[PDB]
Motif scaffolding. Structure first.
Motif, PDB file in Angstrom:
ATOM      1  N   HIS A 315     -11.132   3.987 -10.773  1.00 57.42           N
ATOM      2  CA  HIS A 315     -10.348   3.055  -9.975  1.00 57.42           C
ATOM      3  C   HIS A 315      -9.331   2.274 -10.778  1.00 57.42           C
ATOM      4  O   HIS A 315      -9.623   1.210 -11.328  1.00 57.42           O
ATOM      5  CB  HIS A 315     -11.280   2.107  -9.230  1.00 57.42           C
ATOM      6  N   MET A 316      -8.127   2.827 -10.845  1.00 59.88           N
ATOM      7  CA  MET A 316      -7.037   2.190 -11.559  1.00 59.88           C
ATOM      8  C   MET A 316      -6.734   0.852 -10.890  1.00 59.88           C
ATOM      9  O   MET A 316      -6.341   0.810  -9.722  1.00 59.88           O
ATOM     10  CB  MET A 316      -5.794   3.086 -11.533  1.00 59.88           C
ATOM     11  N   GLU A 317      -6.927  -0.239 -11.624  1.00 58.36           N
ATOM     12  CA  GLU A 317      -6.665  -1.561 -11.074  1.00 58.36           C
ATOM     13  C   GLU A 317      -5.203  -1.948 -11.238  1.00 58.36           C
ATOM     14  O   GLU A 317      -4.701  -2.806 -10.514  1.00 58.36           O
ATOM     15  CB  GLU A 317      -7.543  -2.599 -11.759  1.00 58.36           C
ATOM     16  N   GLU A 318      -4.512  -1.324 -12.189  1.00 64.59           N
ATOM     17  CA  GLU A 318      -3.105  -1.641 -12.388  1.00 64.59           C
ATOM     18  C   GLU A 318      -2.377  -1.411 -11.074  1.00 64.59           C
ATOM     19  O   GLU A 318      -2.870  -0.684 -10.218  1.00 64.59           O
ATOM     20  CB  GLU A 318      -2.491  -0.771 -13.492  1.00 64.59           C
ATOM     21  N   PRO A 319      -1.185  -2.007 -10.903  1.00 64.53           N
ATOM     22  CA  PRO A 319      -0.373  -1.883  -9.692  1.00 64.53           C
ATOM     23  C   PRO A 319      -0.950  -1.066  -8.535  1.00 64.53           C
ATOM     24  O   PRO A 319      -0.781   0.153  -8.450  1.00 64.53           O
ATOM     25  CB  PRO A 319       0.933  -1.331 -10.235  1.00 64.53           C
ATOM     26  N   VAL A 320      -1.634  -1.767  -7.639  1.00 63.50           N
ATOM     27  CA  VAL A 320      -2.240  -1.139  -6.482  1.00 63.50           C
ATOM     28  C   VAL A 320      -1.823  -1.867  -5.208  1.00 63.50           C
ATOM     29  O   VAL A 320      -1.383  -3.020  -5.257  1.00 63.50           O
ATOM     30  CB  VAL A 320      -3.779  -1.148  -6.599  1.00 63.50           C
ATOM     31  N   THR A 321      -1.942  -1.180  -4.074  1.00 66.08           N
ATOM     32  CA  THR A 321      -1.601  -1.754  -2.774  1.00 66.08           C
ATOM     33  C   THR A 321      -2.757  -2.658  -2.324  1.00 66.08           C
ATOM     34  O   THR A 321      -3.727  -2.837  -3.060  1.00 66.08           O
ATOM     35  CB  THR A 321      -1.382  -0.648  -1.695  1.00 66.08           C
ATOM     36  N   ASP A 322      -2.647  -3.217  -1.119  1.00 67.13           N
ATOM     37  CA  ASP A 322      -3.676  -4.099  -0.557  1.00 67.13           C
ATOM     38  C   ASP A 322      -4.897  -3.254  -0.234  1.00 67.13           C
ATOM     39  O   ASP A 322      -5.929  -3.766   0.193  1.00 67.13           O
ATOM     40  CB  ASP A 322      -3.163  -4.782   0.724  1.00 67.13           C
ATOM     41  N   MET A 323      -4.778  -1.947  -0.435  1.00 69.46           N
ATOM     42  CA  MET A 323      -5.901  -1.055  -0.160  1.00 69.46           C
ATOM     43  C   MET A 323      -6.568  -0.609  -1.437  1.00 69.46           C
ATOM     44  O   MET A 323      -7.550   0.132  -1.410  1.00 69.46           O
ATOM     45  CB  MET A 323      -5.436   0.161   0.630  1.00 69.46           C
ATOM     46  N   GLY A 324      -6.034  -1.072  -2.561  1.00 67.79           N
ATOM     47  CA  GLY A 324      -6.596  -0.694  -3.842  1.00 67.79           C
ATOM     48  C   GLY A 324      -6.083   0.650  -4.331  1.00 67.79           C
ATOM     49  O   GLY A 324      -6.673   1.255  -5.226  1.00 67.79           O
ATOM     50  N   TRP A 325      -4.986   1.126  -3.751  1.00 65.37           N
ATOM     51  CA  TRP A 325      -4.430   2.405  -4.181  1.00 65.37           C
ATOM     52  C   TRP A 325      -3.388   2.202  -5.281  1.00 65.37           C
ATOM     53  O   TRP A 325      -2.471   1.406  -5.132  1.00 65.37           O
ATOM     54  CB  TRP A 325      -3.788   3.152  -2.999  1.00 65.37           C
ATOM     55  N   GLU A 326      -3.530   2.923  -6.387  1.00 67.54           N
ATOM     56  CA  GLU A 326      -2.580   2.806  -7.489  1.00 67.54           C
ATOM     57  C   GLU A 326      -1.160   3.184  -7.063  1.00 67.54           C
ATOM     58  O   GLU A 326      -0.963   4.037  -6.191  1.00 67.54           O
ATOM     59  CB  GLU A 326      -3.018   3.700  -8.648  1.00 67.54           C
ATOM     60  N   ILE A 327      -0.169   2.547  -7.681  1.00 67.85           N
ATOM     61  CA  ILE A 327       1.236   2.833  -7.383  1.00 67.85           C
ATOM     62  C   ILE A 327       1.847   3.635  -8.539  1.00 67.85           C
ATOM     63  O   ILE A 327       2.435   3.061  -9.462  1.00 67.85           O
ATOM     64  CB  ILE A 327       2.068   1.540  -7.222  1.00 67.85           C
ATOM     65  N   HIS A 328       1.727   4.959  -8.474  1.00 63.76           N
ATOM     66  CA  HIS A 328       2.253   5.829  -9.524  1.00 63.76           C
ATOM     67  C   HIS A 328       3.273   6.828  -8.975  1.00 63.76           C
ATOM     68  O   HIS A 328       2.963   8.008  -8.806  1.00 63.76           O
ATOM     69  CB  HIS A 328       1.091   6.589 -10.175  1.00 63.76           C
ATOM     70  N   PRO A 329       4.507   6.374  -8.700  1.00 63.75           N
ATOM     71  CA  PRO A 329       5.559   7.245  -8.166  1.00 63.75           C
ATOM     72  C   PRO A 329       5.829   8.507  -8.988  1.00 63.75           C
ATOM     73  O   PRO A 329       6.315   9.507  -8.452  1.00 63.75           O
ATOM     74  CB  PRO A 329       6.773   6.318  -8.089  1.00 63.75           C
ATOM     75  N   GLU A 330       5.519   8.462 -10.281  1.00 63.93           N
ATOM     76  CA  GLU A 330       5.710   9.625 -11.150  1.00 63.93           C
ATOM     77  C   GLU A 330       4.890  10.795 -10.617  1.00 63.93           C
ATOM     78  O   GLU A 330       5.350  11.937 -10.600  1.00 63.93           O
ATOM     79  CB  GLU A 330       5.264   9.310 -12.586  1.00 63.93           C
ATOM     80  N   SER A 331       3.672  10.498 -10.176  1.00 68.06           N
ATOM     81  CA  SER A 331       2.778  11.533  -9.656  1.00 68.06           C
ATOM     82  C   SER A 331       3.322  12.240  -8.417  1.00 68.06           C
ATOM     83  O   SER A 331       3.010  13.406  -8.178  1.00 68.06           O
ATOM     84  CB  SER A 331       1.400  10.935  -9.356  1.00 68.06           C
ATOM     85  N   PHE A 332       4.136  11.532  -7.636  1.00 67.40           N
ATOM     86  CA  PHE A 332       4.736  12.089  -6.431  1.00 67.40           C
ATOM     87  C   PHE A 332       5.729  13.187  -6.828  1.00 67.40           C
ATOM     88  O   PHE A 332       5.719  14.274  -6.258  1.00 67.40           O
ATOM     89  CB  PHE A 332       5.443  10.974  -5.648  1.00 67.40           C
TER      90      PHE A 332
END
Ligand code: G2F
Length: 445
Positions: A315-332
């Motif tokens: 569970h990546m705690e770094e930059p996550v939404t209100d749902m606890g989802w990580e924000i990694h645009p690179e992965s997209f």
């Protein structure tokens, strides 16, 4: 440092029938599996149900109008099966009518619709017969799909057969986290097989009726990273990959299930006994495009527990939404590249769902959802890098035009770019929504 998208890039917004409509016992609609599901204690946060929701059933004319002024040209919605087939073979005119009037508004406003056939709201009377674990349910879908194709077809530019077969099967019959809520891996895989066939079913009914509108299925996919360089973690990531991506993508483009995964499931697959002659062929029909739904990557490590996969999600705690989802645009950008490389290697790619849930607050009639905003933009930069680099991405539909029933999360999570006040049902666009309108204008940023 600017990002101008193609001249023909399709920009739109998406929603789902049960998630916004409300009107659960109106117009002849009978209970769907989620209406039963939301009632089981502990299945959905706060015990929330799809009762009323955004009440789009009554505010639809305004919502479509509100879309136009917002700058949108495309709108993806789904049809509520319980609203069309409230019972075994009956056809509810009052329901086919609701979507008709909805289409009138869509066209009146000058928008291009995308009708999603199945978006998890299976009629409870069908679940009673065994639901997705029964081949016969595929016949009930054929009935449903034909009626809708004949009643329309001459007004639909894009057909989205099934939205995320993985959720409706794996989570619905396997983990018990979605409706109907079973916890049986033999059912989840049988269900994944039958729903995947319904995509072929609709694709056949599509060719036979000679419709001209595009057709494609929608898969929720995710880029997977190993937690460390340890062999077991790398193996763990591979499994997770086949579990969500390959098990649905492989049959769609290759006419087969991932061999490694088929082995890992073994006993639960019961020897692929649920596969009859012609099934795989029926399922291998890419269509005119491939819809994709993405939110975040997964970091995987190995465990030796009692779970099907025996994998753990760091569970990546770094930059996550209100749902606890990580924000990694690179992965997209990374996932899109991998999708083209295999499976779609050519076929047009349409992003049917992308967005984020953050905490929203009202500051004098406006919502400064800078967070959600930054999320869309950043992820759009990934789509842009995919394009320009030879990527066949032809469209993007921001998830949730309005805040809605976020399934097991209930109403606590808002993905809307347009704020919904559930005490009054009034709509109020968020800053991110205004940003999108400007963006689509210059067609870039
Ligand atoms: C894409 O995911 C969002 C966020 O969980 C859901 O609300 C949509 O139904 C799904 F298609």
């Amino acid at each position: 440092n600017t990002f101008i998208f193609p001249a023909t890039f399709m920009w739109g917004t998406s929603t789902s029938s049960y998630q916004i409509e409300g009107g659960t016992d109106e117009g002849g609609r009978t209970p769907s599996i989620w209406d039963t599901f939301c009632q089981i204690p502990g299945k959905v946060i706060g015990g929330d149900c799809g009762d009323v929701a955004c009440d789009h059933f009554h505010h639809f004319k305004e919502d479509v109008q509100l879309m136009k002024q917002l700058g949108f040209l495309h709108y993806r919605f789904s049809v509520a099966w319980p609203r069309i087939m409230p019972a075994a073979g009956i056809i509810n005119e009052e329901g086919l009518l609701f979507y008709e009037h909805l289409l009138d508004e869509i066209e009146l406003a000058g928008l291009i619709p995308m009708l999603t056939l199945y978006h998890w709201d299976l009629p409870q009377w069908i679940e009673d017969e065994g639901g997705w674990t029964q081949r016969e349910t595929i016949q009930h879908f054929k009935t449903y799909a034909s009626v809708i194709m004949d009643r329309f077809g001459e007004r639909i530019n894009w057909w989205n057969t099934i939205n995320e077969p993985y959720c409706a099967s794996i989570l619905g019959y396997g983990t018990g986290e979605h409706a109907p809520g079973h916890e049986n891996w033999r059912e989840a895989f049988t269900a994944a097989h039958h729903i995947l066939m319904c995509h072929g079913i609709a694709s056949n009914l599509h060719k036979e009726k000679g419709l001209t509108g595009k057709i494609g299925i929608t898969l929720n996919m995710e880029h997977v990273d190993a937690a460390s360089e340890r062999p077991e973690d790398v193996a763990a990531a591979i499994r997770r990959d086949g579990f969500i991506n390959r098990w649905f993508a492989e049959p769609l483009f290759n006419g087969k299930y991932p061999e490694d995964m088929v082995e890992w499931y073994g006993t639960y697959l019961n020897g692929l006994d649920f596969v009859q002659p012609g099934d795989m062929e029926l399922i291998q029909q890419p269509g005119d495009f491939l819809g994709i739904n993405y939110y975040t990557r997964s970091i995987i490590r190995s465990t030796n527990d009692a779970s099907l996969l025996q994998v753990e999600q760091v569970h990546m705690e770094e930059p996550v939404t209100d749902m606890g989802w990580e924000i990694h645009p690179e992965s997209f950008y990374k996932l899109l590249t991998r999708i083209e490389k295999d499976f779609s290697k050519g076929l047009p790619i349409l992003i049917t769902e992308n967005g984020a849930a953050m905490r929203d607050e009202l500051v004098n009639g406006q919502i400064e959802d800078t967070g959600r905003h930054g999320y869309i933009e950043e992820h759009l930069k990934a789509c842009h890098r995919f394009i320009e680099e030879g990527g066949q991405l032809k469209g993007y539909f921001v998830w949730s035009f309005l805040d809605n029933f976020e399934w097991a999360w209930g109403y606590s999570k808002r993905f809307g770019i347009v704020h919904i006040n559930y005490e009054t049902q009034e709509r109020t666009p968020k800053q991110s929504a205004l940003w999108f309108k400007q963006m689509m204008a210059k067609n870039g940023f």
